[PDB]
Design a protein around this ligand. Structure first.
Ligand SMILES: Nc1ncnc2c1ncn2[C@@H]1O[C@H](COP(=O)(O)O)[C@@H](O)[C@H]1O
Ligand SMILES: Nc1ncnc2c1ncn2[C@@H]1O[C@H](COP(=O)(O)O)[C@@H](O)[C@H]1O
Ligand SMILES: N[C@@H](Cc1c[nH]c[nH+]1)C(=O)O
Ligand SMILES: N[C@@H](Cc1c[nH]c[nH+]1)C(=O)O
Lengths: 409, 409
RNA sequence: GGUGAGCGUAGCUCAGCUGGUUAGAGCACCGGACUGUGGUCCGGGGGUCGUGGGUUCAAGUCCCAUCGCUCACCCCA
RNA sequence: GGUGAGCGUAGCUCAGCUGGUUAGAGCACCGGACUGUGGUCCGGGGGUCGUGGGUUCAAGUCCCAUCGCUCACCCCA
């Protein structure tokens, strides 16, 4: 009567194998670029994540938070282990569970899995271009075609302040034309209005001729973006240039980017990232510029199935033993143990009629069926059937492992 | 100024690789015995674990608990996914983080990692013997010699009740001879007295001639144990027969076992397990007998280092690019991107004096050094130095990937 | 978490007229036809028809509430 | 979490008399000797000597408290 809580699922079979293949490919791609793997704890002190989440208190009274994102934790790792003394920039990657408290729907859960990449210790645009390329290439190496790379810039703080003051200035005399959500947004989060799903809002934005965030980038942010774009253009990486890519937290600066896939539901963002500056100071350290991305293993799985990529059928045991009598069971056990783990060998735990056991072996997709009846037990032998060719040989036990080794090579 | 909380650490380099090797070996060994991999969520509803732990409440008011153990969660998985209709017994294994709230010391943390195995759906002693063998063989396959297998039985509930009434009966008239801890234990948990580290307690136990738990096993539990022992003896698995192996929770019945290693501190238990019956009913289901084990990846790492097993040196990049001028950097980047992820290729982010870059390449253990100066840039070329033989060739860029592929094969 | 909408019939996929008097099919597990061998034939264990109430001579069916699953919005690091 | 004990000097390994007047060494990062090539020579950025108080003419040093790390016990699924 006890169930996994809402927003969390168990993982096994093809789906788990799916996740594993994805993470393996990420490991390969990122480590080819010299990234170093990191694993941070599942919870951190609350302070590191407050800059909607699972928060509690240990007996010591300290407020802890179940990890909602990777980036901040990896910067904390940068600080704690004195990575400032390593050759900069330092590239880190991590794959693991993340926890958020929003209502589920397709591709959005309360416990999900993320792959994260961070390049820390440098402001160079080449790093940004590289991050985009690495995300793109993880997804590509999986096999995915049909992806949309979105690129933009949130600018430096002054720029975003300008854009907000401007959005407010323009939209305030027409607030009654706005839907409720957009009114609430106008009060504090005006750039969210730009992404509104309300048709009337988009219409009003159109007719008021609202300028993009692009037009509000200062000289520095703009030149930086031009360098990034230049690099992506050299590497022939196509990307949609976006009017704006709204980032919530205001330690994000300059480059912002996302990668989308069709189907897989409304939440079409496979992964996203960008540049940040100010994060490590809120963590109590000095100035460490960063650029990095995170993507969702689940949504990538969804995308992979959407494009028809499946997994090669799961390999079955090399030998499946079928005991015909009561006392044979144990013997099978013993025999199986003699063969493991060099071979994969399984056995039935109760006496089976030979046909039923043969069937249970075919169902599990075994290469060999073993028969142990009173004949075999009496001669200290086993019967061996190669299921692919229907061949059958009767062997002494002590000559069996040499047989299977030579047969399965 | 923000640190990982007490009892939790970050993981990278040799230690992480260590963990990974261990889990890989476990995967191999257990799957050779036909176990199926499972991953359950990090938190569950509190009910599944209360039969000292990280407990909280979501906004919905529901009490959740950060996973302190594997077994109960895997039984919950057995129930939820209708595994009663699979061919019994079903064998499951899982590797992942566990969370407990006790004070740390060597080999004992607040977030640690476990490997778990469960065989569910059968009472057959062969399963118990198999579980012991699988634990033993995981550790062995890692490379460990010098292990101590402890085996015993907690008996069926009636038996443990008898043993407790007996311990109380004997020890009560001599309570003043007991240390404080043992008095507290005598009040409720008398079998803990048997494991007391107090010398006076052990002396008193000796002189009162206290009988072992072994002498209190009823016919069923005893015959079961004899079957298990018989199987282990056939497979030549040496094990220390213990007077008692005290289990806390009273859904544990019959077989109990542990595996220990010297050094690695007081907490010398690498892993342990046994049989249970009653767990699935508290989870609201029917009767599902189980036997299984869990071991600590950390303590196994400690044991592996204690016995001198180290990791083969981490492979360095196939190519390390050294830009000599400002404009070469980007070029290096481009070149590196042309080569990934088929090759591992890295690059310096700033102009380096050739010797310093050569040194940075030797330090990172690269196979090839690339030189990009104005000469190379002007001829659209690169310089390539095989560090192992000191050879050096000057190549056009568009003939480089064919070169390295042929060189590194 | 807030707002919606649509689903809840065996472990899984599903049929079942606002009702009708003794709740069904495949898969899955299990046992027997058949003398120790290849994925034919018969039975079998199983469900509080998600849960509680209301209506009724009668509720899987209708009404109400509640819980869960699903998708969408708010939010999005 | 409770009870102990021992440690806190640069990112890492450590030296420094209950005191002495201008805090040190290796590693690591970084720059220059040296004209574009192999793991010699000089400098350099760095520390609130874990933190707060007390003592003193004077505190890394002594006293007190506090926080952290480590190990051991309680507990152990
Ligand atoms: N609640 C969630 N459930 C599943 N996947 C998520 C969730 N939140 C984020 N992701 C994935 O992680 C990526 C980055 O998330 P974010 O941290 O919001 O930038 C997204 O593009 C998704 O692929
Ligand atoms: N707090 C802990 N920290 C590290 N390892 C642990 C911890 N608790 C248990 N283990 C490991 O997990 C095994 C089984 O734990 P238990 O659940 O107590 O049977 C032990 O033998 C240890 O190897
Ligand atoms: N959600 C973050 C994830 C991230 C990874 N690195 C930096 N940020 C983003 O889109 O930017
Ligand atoms: N601590 C448990 C772990 C376990 C795994 N399976 C069953 N039990 C034990 O020793 O028994």
């Amino acid at each position: 009567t006890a169930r996994a809580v809402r927003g969390t699922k168990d993982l096994f079979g093809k789906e788990l194998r799916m996740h594993q293949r994805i993470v393996a490919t990420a490991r390969k791609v990122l480590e080819a670029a010299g990234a170093l793997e990191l694993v941070t704890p599942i919870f951190e002190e609350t302070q590191v994540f407050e800059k909607e989440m699972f928060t509690f208190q240990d007996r010591g009274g300290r407020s802890l938070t179940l990890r909602p994102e990777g980036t901040a934790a990896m910067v904390r790792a940068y600080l704690e282990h004195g990575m400032k003394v390593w050759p900069q920039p330092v590239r880190l990657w991590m794959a693991g569970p993340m926890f958020r408290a929003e209502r589920p729907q397709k591709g959005r859960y309360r416990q999900f899995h993320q792959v994260n990449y961070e390049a820390l210790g440098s402001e160079n645009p080449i790093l940004d271009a590289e991050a985009v390329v690495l995300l793109y290439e993880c997804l590509k190496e999986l096999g995915l075609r049909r992806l949309k790379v979105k690129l933009s810039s949130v600018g430096d703080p002054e720029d975003r302040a300008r854009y907000n003051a401007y959005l407010r200035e323009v939209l305030s005399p027409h607030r009654e034309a706005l839907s409720e959500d957009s009114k609430e947004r106008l009060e504090l989060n005006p750039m969210r209005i730009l992404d509104s799903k309300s048709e009337r809002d988009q219409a009003l934005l159109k007719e008021l001729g609202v300028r993009p965030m692009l037009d509000f980038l200062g000289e520095e942010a703009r030149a930086h973006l031009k360098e990034v774009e230049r690099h992506l253009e050299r590497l022939s990486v196509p990307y949609e240039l976006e009017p704006a890519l709204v980032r919530g937290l205001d330690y994000y600066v300059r480059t912002a980017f996302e990668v989308h896939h069709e189907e897989i539901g409304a939440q079409s963002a496979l992964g996203g990232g960008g540049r940040y500056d100010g994060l490590s100071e809120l963590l109590g350290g000095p100035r460490v510029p960063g650029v990095g991305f995170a993507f969702g293993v689940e949504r990538v799985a969804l995308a992979l199935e959407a494009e028809g990529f499946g997994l090669p059928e799961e390999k079955g045991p090399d030998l499946y033993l079928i005991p015909l009598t009561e006392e044979a069971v144990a013997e099978a056990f013993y025999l199986a143990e003699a063969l493991r783990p060099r071979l994969r060998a399984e056995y039935a735990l109760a006496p089976r009629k030979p046909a039923k056991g043969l069937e249970e072996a075919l169902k599990r997709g075994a290469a060999f069926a073993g028969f142990l009846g009173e004949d075999e037990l009496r001669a200290g032998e086993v019967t061996l059937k190669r299921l692919a060719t229907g061949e059958q040989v009767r062997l002494s036990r002590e000559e069996v492992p040499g047989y299977l080794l030579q047969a399965l090579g």
